Amino acid sequence: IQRYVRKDGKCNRYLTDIFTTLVDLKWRFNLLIFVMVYTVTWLFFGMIWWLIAYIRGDMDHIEDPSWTPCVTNLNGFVSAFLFSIETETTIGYGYRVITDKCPEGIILLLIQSVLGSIVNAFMVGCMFVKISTLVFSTHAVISMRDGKLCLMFRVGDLRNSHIVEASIRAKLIKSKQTSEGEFIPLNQTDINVGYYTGDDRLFLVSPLIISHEINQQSPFWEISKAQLPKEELEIVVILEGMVEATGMTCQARSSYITSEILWGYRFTPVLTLEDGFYEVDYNSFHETYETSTPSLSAKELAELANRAES
Amino acid sequence: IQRYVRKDGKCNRYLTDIFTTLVDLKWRFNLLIFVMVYTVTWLFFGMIWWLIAYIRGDMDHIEDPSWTPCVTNLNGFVSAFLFSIETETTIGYGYRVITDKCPEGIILLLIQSVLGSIVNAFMVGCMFVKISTLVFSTHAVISMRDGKLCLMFRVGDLRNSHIVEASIRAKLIKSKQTSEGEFIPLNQTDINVGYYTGDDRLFLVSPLIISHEINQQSPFWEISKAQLPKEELEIVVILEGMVEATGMTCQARSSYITSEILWGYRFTPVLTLEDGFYEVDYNSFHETYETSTPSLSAKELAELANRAES
Amino acid sequence: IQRYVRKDGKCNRYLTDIFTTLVDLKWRFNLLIFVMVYTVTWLFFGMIWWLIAYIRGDMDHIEDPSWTPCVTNLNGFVSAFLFSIETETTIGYGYRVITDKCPEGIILLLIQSVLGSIVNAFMVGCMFVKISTLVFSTHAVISMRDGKLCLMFRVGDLRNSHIVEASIRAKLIKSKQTSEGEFIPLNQTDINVGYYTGDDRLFLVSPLIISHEINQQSPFWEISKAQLPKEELEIVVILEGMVEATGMTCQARSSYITSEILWGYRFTPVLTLEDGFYEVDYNSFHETYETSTPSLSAKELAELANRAES
Amino acid sequence: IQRYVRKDGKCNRYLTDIFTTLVDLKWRFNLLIFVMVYTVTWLFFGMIWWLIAYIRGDMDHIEDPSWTPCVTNLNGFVSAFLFSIETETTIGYGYRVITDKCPEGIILLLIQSVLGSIVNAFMVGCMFVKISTLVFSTHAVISMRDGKLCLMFRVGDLRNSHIVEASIRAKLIKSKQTSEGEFIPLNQTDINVGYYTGDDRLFLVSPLIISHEINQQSPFWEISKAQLPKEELEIVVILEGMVEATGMTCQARSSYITSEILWGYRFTPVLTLEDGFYEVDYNSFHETYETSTPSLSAKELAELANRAES
């Protein structure tokens, strides 16, 4: 596409996967499907019972002789759904005699019991799996901090709750042409976010600015304001944080195209102490303000520094 | 609050969230709620079942004249809750006929069956999730050790059962002022407790003093004894380890403020080995005993060594 | 063997183990064995009942007298499987009485009930455990990249969903000869695929070329194009990554024997770019087209470059 | 103790942990205890039913001339354990009267139902939790490898399964003495078994000799053969591996002592080729032989080599 990975976390005929994702449903949808399957099974078994009643429908409905046709289930009407409910739900009341010695399809009862236990097991499994928030800045910025040009992207958690001890990874994807003439459509170069020093794992208790220093080994070493607009480089940032309870790393992914990166601006502070509690403005959490950042190349700035040292 | 993370492990209208907290309950609380929901279901079902026979309940309670006004039940006005218990718990005794041929409403027993299965499934699921110790020094200290100024804090296991694969990470939170003049309220800079050499990952069999050397890279590089009181920088130290008995990872957080960071001290001995075993005293683990350590800063101590070189 | 680890992922009387793998069965096989075992348990219960009633199967069956050799149950000798189905499935219809005076032993019912509960409990857990792809290029290649010789192997995600957070680890197993004189049959030397730089934890949208630079530290540092056929060195590469949809860890072992690792070839581009249209074809993933890669030994080539520099 | 951690993996009043130990039982023990629990529940309820027989023992209990002393359950004798089995496991027949309209309390049925459901749920949960190989060389050896002194300890997996990512970590515990005169009784100093080079996650298809080179940073940098016995160094090695089929992490802990470390010893090849195919001999795993090595210290050896080369 134009943008490789979208800003939310997405990059840009099967009868088994539908069953797998059916367990991943809202509780109301799950209970609704759970009642519907049972109702269908009861209705089908009741229809089966009426088909077994074709043998004795009119011969001795109330004659009660020594042999009434071959009475099975002792029910005189098509409303034998009572017998079906009692057999499936294992609540046989005996008002309807389970069966006579007459050779009916007792195997129909064998099917109801196994099917019910199997349907019940499936429903229990579906109930078991079903019952058992990070934000990045809109515009990553470039600013001059502590004598070095740096690339800054802010990270936070919108909710008051924060998933502490997060880890950050940054990958710059852009096309590279090598010395031999090899063209790689999507070259991936990792960005230092403190991995060497162990600074990747950090606390986000407040919204904080993740900083990549531009240096000789950095992918941006020779990036300058002059050519940064044209270059199609794309930055993709993945954040993995283990939740406070039953912690598991959740991948919060964002992207920054050359348009989103801004030169000469830096994020505007989000923390201000009032009455011992630090006001956190999520409205200004993304907002960036102009700073006096040199427009020369980072390598050019280093060369100017060495010239000054002499 | 002025102190960011407290010493214990804490930093300083929803139907689903309360339901999630309810599954996380004591065993006694869980069995109590499990019996209470069933009792409510049985009582409600008894009342609703009583409503169906209201027309024939007084018409012929025991008269049964020529089997007329069939009640769709053989139950009497009082203690008809037995029919509710039989329907919900699937005992299905035939003393009271579940449903007479007279139709009335047979859908009441369908509702009871689905509700009972659903309530049973939810209770089983809540029961399934329910069934299925590190300590830090009160005061961190600084002393001269092995020719280098160092910062030490005790880390111990309260229970004799060991915690394997303990990893210790220390992050110092203080407000940095950049060269540009952009103020960072909560700048987090990592402290090297052995991450490079793999000394970070340690097996704690007894309380062991984790030590960070104050070198050029250390945030404390230029902290003299006079400076340590002045600065309000805070340490946050986290130990993540799994139990020896079971592979369950526990994360224990702790904090240290300038008030609890002492100078010219060293921890006392927790273990003295004699009589066939280590003599373990946790009385002295929190306690410290003073030492004579140069008041000059670590950078200043290296400067003093340079002066000795002259 | 000739090849240590095969190309797919494989390297080259117990009641508990077969039982453990039995839970890992196809859904159809599991439901089939479940219904079959339930039917078998029911068939056995019916047979034991005939033996229990064997003494009174005639004596009071023919007489139909009052409490005189009254049978254990009010059932006939033939079609007595109904009693077993009712007792085991907990239907308890009551046309046949559960136990009578002059019982002749009611112990069988206790055994049947415990066995039935145990069977259901055991086979619900099996149902629960049961209900609750990266391709490597066939031929690793050697190409001249960025002014240095490099060993590169293509990794492809067959699934349209992109694999995320993939870590690559490469180990060269060779018959190392020590200077001491010890001959190590299977000496494992790790290969640097970006571990220090952090490039191992790569993000693959499309099949990408994993590259190892042949430097002094590299195991194949002195390997030569003439000797590339001679050697018996084998490369084992393992990829552990998370799917975008799900965080599932997998292992994909591969082998690159002396013959499979070509010299002078570079991979075929998988991605087709059409005005922002990205197409990934796995038909061309394995193809390699030749380049005039320098055939001198990497160490020899570096030394020649050094001599040229002078 | 004399030895801190034993060679197998061990280092050297509660009503909650007993339940955990009971869930952690053999399958036979779990089914046995469950059947015993069911028998206890039924037997206790049956007595209680005989106690309910106190109010109406024989007034119309047998003869039944009138409804006087109409029984809660129509059971003539103390052997009313048929009623207990029927009520608790929900197979009520009705040959024995379920309830009457003259009872002294039918709360016992409610108690029986709740206890039975709770017992079944607990016994299903226990069954669910219940249903749902590394070895080291007996004595480590210090030998001359590739012209440099090294510490070698052989580790392998007995089962042929291809355990993956068998990361190995070595910690040397000794009573190190500081310049201050305060000696930590246990000082954990990390040993570089490949963590710096990324060689730690070794494969164990063939038993393989883990090698630690002795350099300036190595703990044994100054140790010598004749001086090895006097020292108190204790080496503890922990190996973590995963089985092929996404197996759970398995942690094996082993130890060594001063007299279990030997000089000029090389493990004999665990696998020796037979008939053109290498043969695995777990009998030869622990086997060692005396090899020709120099007896001087590693630091002293380095100084001697430097003197020879000036």
Domain residue spans of chain B: 1-13+133-310, 14-132
Element (H, E) at A249: strand A249-256
**CB of A198 within 8 Å of any CB in chain D?**
no
Compute the 3-state secondary structure of chain A and give helix, strand, coil in percent, each to the nearest 5: 25, 25, 50
Q: Whose CA is closest to D173, among D4, D1, D2?
A: D4
**CB of B90 within 8 Å of any CB in chain C?**
yes
List the structure tokens of A254: 């964002």
Cα–Cα dist C204/C135, whole Å: 13
Across the A:D interface, residue pairs with CB atoms under 8 Å apart total 3
Q: Whose CA is closest to D80, among D52, D111, D110?
A: D52
Chain A nearest-CA residue for B119: A31
Q: Whose CA is closest to D96, among C88, B94, A305?
A: B94
Among A83, A84, A131, A208, most B C-beta atoms within 10 A, so best to mutate, is A131
Q: Give contacts of D90 with chain A, Cβ < 8 Å.
A: 90
Q: What is the DSSP string of chain C?
A: --SSB-TTS-B---HHHHHHHHHSS-HHHHHHHHHHHHHHHHHHHHHHHHHHTTTHHHHTTTT--SSSS--SSS--SSS-HHHHHHHHHT---SSS-S--SS-S--HHHHHHHHHHHHHHHHHHHHHHHHH--EEE-SS-EEEEETTEEEEEEEEEE-SSSPEEEEEEEEEEEE--B-TTS-B-TTEEEEE-SSTTTTTTEEEESS-EEEEEE--SSSTTTT--TTTTTT---EEEEEEEEEESSS---------B-TTTS-SSEEEPP-EEEETTEEEE-SSSTT-EEE-----S-HHHHHHHHHHHH-
B58-B60-B62 Cα angle (round to 5): 110
Q: Beta partners for C234?
A: C173
DSSP state of B65: G
Q: What is the DSSP string of D38-88?
A: HHHHHHHHHHHHHHHTTTTSSSSSSS-SSSTT--SS---SS--HHHHHHHH
CA distances from A113 to B87, B135, D89, D162, D167 (A): 18, 57, 16, 44, 52
Q: Whose CA is closest to C54, among C108, C15, C132?
A: C108
Among D203, D274, D293, most C C-beta atoms within 10 A, so best to mutate, is D203
Are residues C186 and D153 in contact, defined by beta-carbon separation less than 8 angstroms?
no
Count the neighbouring beta carbons within 10 Å of the beta carbon of residue D102: 14
**CB of C175 within 8 Å of any CB in chain B?**
no
The owner of tokens 């001697």 is D304
Compute the 3-state secondary structure of chain D and give helix, strand, coil in percent, each to the nearest 5: 25, 25, 50
Are residues C206 and C280 in contact, defined by beta-carbon separation less than 8 angstroms?
yes
Residues contacting residue B284 through CB under 8 Å, at least 6 positions apart: B267, B268, B269, B270
Of C31, C78, C89, the CB nearest to A118: C31
Residue B88 phi/psi, 5-degree rounding, is -75, -40
Chain B nearest-CA residue for D198: B198
**CB of B89 within 8 Å of any CB in chain C?**
no
3-state SS assignment for residue D110 = helix
| Phi-psi label, residue C198: left if phi above 0, alpha if psi -120 to 50, beta otherwise | left
CA atoms within 13 A on the CB side of A200: 17
Minimal C-alpha gap between D94 and chain A (Å):
8
List the structure tokens of C209: 């070329």
Cα–Cα dist A257/A2, whole Å: 9
3-state SS assignment for residue B115 = helix
Are residues A232 and A256 in contact, defined by beta-carbon separation less than 8 angstroms?
no
**CB of D90 within 8 Å of any CB in chain A?**
yes
* CB burial readout B233-263, b (16+ within 10 A) else e: bbbbbbbbbbbbeeeeeebbbbbbbeebbbb
Are residues B164 and D13 in contact, defined by beta-carbon separation less than 8 angstroms?
no
List the structure tokens of C53: 């009633």
**CB of B197 within 8 Å of any CB in chain D?**
yes
Residues after which chain A is discontinuous, using a C–N cutoff of 2.5 Å: 12, 132
Cα–Cα dist A86/D91, whole Å: 12
Cα–Cα dist B11/A205, whole Å: 8
Minimal C-alpha gap between B92 and chain C (Å):
8
Q: Residue A94 and residue D94: Cβ atoms within 8 Å?
A: yes
Minimal C-alpha gap between A281 and chain C (Å):
32
Locate all alpha helices (DSSP H) within A74-191, ordered by sequence: 81-88, 107-131
Cα–Cα dist B62/B78, whole Å: 12
Q: Are strands D208-213 and D148-157 parallel, antiparallel or unpaired?
A: antiparallel
Residues contacting residue C181 through CB under 8 Å, at least 6 positions apart: none
Q: Give contacts of A109 with chain C, Cβ < 8 Å.
A: 85
Contacts of A among chains (3+ CB pairs under 8 A)? B, C, D
List the structure tokens of A129: 């799996």
B227-B229-B232 Cα angle (round to 5): 95
Q: Residue C94 and residue A99: Cβ atoms within 8 Å?
A: no
Are residues A71 and A60 in contact, defined by beta-carbon separation less than 8 angstroms?
yes
Cα–Cα dist D80/D88, whole Å: 13
List the structure tokens of B108: 């009441």
**CB of C94 within 8 Å of any CB in chain B?**
yes
Q: Residue B147 and residue D11: Cβ atoms within 8 Å?
A: no
Q: Residue A165 and residue B91: Cβ atoms within 8 Å?
A: no
**CB of D198 within 8 Å of any CB in chain A?**
no
Q: Residue D91 and residue C94: Cβ atoms within 8 Å?
A: no
Q: Whose CA is closest to B178, among A149, D92, D132?
A: A149
DSSP state of A156: E
Method: cryo-EM
Q: Terminus-to-terminus CA distance in chain C, angstroms?
A: 48
Q: Residue B90 and residue C94: Cβ atoms within 8 Å?
A: no
Interface of B with D in 38-57 (CB under 8 A): 38-39, 42
Q: Are strands C208-213 and C271-274 parallel, antiparallel or unpaired?
A: unpaired
Q: Residue D99 and residue B93: Cβ atoms within 8 Å?
A: yes
**CB of A58 within 8 Å of any CB in chain C?**
no
Q: What is the DSSP string of B9-51?
A: S-B---HHHHHHHHHS--HHHHHHHHHHHHHHHHHHHHHHHHH
